[PDB]
């Protein structure tokens, strides 16, 4: 009932993990719409490198396309195909 | 090759998800040690409620105990059993 140092280290270390990302972050120049859902699950670089002079950055990336409700409030609503960035390989760099 | 509105909505919605949490956040009063790994995978409340006057907060919580390397720098190192908070049920509240 205690997680062992090498499991932890292994699970925590820099990798692509499923991460919930606010859409407003990905599209910060959106004056026009609110979004539903407001956040989307994307594979993103998460974890630690365990070395202050390193950071976990993606190497290889691929676009994924999703159906998002775009509400122009008090005006209307529709469903829009939205492209989001995904990370396929992460690795520790300076 | 396009994620369908109801999948997205379903996957994005408020739930316990595996999240990498910096240890320094959980123990912000730590003057003495650096930690290895510096971040740990914990089940935490993530997602959206899709309703500006709501937020995704945990209901039921449980402590998990992990083995972390604690380095007092230029002094020494050891392995320490560290308790971290985990969320078992999340739900949307005001």
């Amino acid at each position, epitope marked *: 009932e205690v997680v062992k140092f090498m499991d932890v280290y292994q699970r925590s270390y820099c990798h692509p993990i499923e991460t919930l990302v606010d859409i407003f972050q990905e599209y910060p120049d959106e004056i026009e719409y609110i979004f539903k859902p407001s956040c989307v699950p994307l594979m993103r670089c998460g974890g630690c490198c365990n070395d202050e002079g390193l950071e976990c950055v993606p190497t290889e990336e691929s676009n994924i396309t999703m159906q998002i409700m775009r509400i122009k409030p008090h005006q209307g*609503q529709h*469903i829009g195909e939205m492209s989001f960035l995904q990370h396929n390989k992460c690795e520790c760099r300076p | 090759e396009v994620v369908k509105f109801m999948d997205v909505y379903q996957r994005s919605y408020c739930h316990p998800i595996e999240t990498l949490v910096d240890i320094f956040q959980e123990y912000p009063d730590e003057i003495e040690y650096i930690f290895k790994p510096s971040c740990v995978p914990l089940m935490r409340c993530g997602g959206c409620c899709n309703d500006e006057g709501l937020e995704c907060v945990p209901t039921e919580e449980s402590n998990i105990t992990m083995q972390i390397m604690r380095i007092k720098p230029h002094q020494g190192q050891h392995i320490g059993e560290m308790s971290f908070l985990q969320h078992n049920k999340c739900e949307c509240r005001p």
Partner: antibody
Amino acid sequence: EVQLVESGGGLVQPGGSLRLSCAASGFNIKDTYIHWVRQAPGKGLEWVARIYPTNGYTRYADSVKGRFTISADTSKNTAYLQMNSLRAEDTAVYYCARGGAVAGTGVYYFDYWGQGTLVTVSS
Amino acid sequence: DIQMTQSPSSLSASVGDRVTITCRASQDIPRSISGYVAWYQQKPGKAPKLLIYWGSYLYSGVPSRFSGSGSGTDFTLTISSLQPEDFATYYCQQHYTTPPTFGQGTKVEIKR
């Protein structure tokens, strides 16, 4: 048990005025858009007006702007349409309808309709 | 302001037939955009009832023989096996913008 019950239709003269009511029940009109939609005899459906009761925001079709006013009294759970300067082309069945809430935001379709009230603009 | 053009204007079909009715938006909307059309059924001297919302979702209590789809400017309501009680006028409605507008209707007669 959602219901919308329109009243106050009837005969009215050209240039006259009429106020329609819509009594809602099984829900709070606070949480929804209320609309009026009309249908001239034997014709299609024409949206006339919309109210967001909390803040009292209104929108209108051009054919009725400046003559019709939509409102809502949240304490009586009742929506109104005040109709002024009526002409024969305003003759129609007038329906109240709601757009419920989904994903914490009003929908822009009409999920419940009352049964309508006939307005006849004639001398 | 979107005008919606509905076709056909009227049709005659037999019980069990598949019926298809279309709605075209007047404005140039591309195929990546969908879910802005609702469809209603109106029987004579009755209020319309909602059948399909957000382009293609079936409204609760509506029989499953009704369905819808579409994208861009082009939407479709299908009745997969026409019943005698499906005698009606059917209307589409856009809510891409305000004012929301209606097509002008398709009158379905049951051929017997």
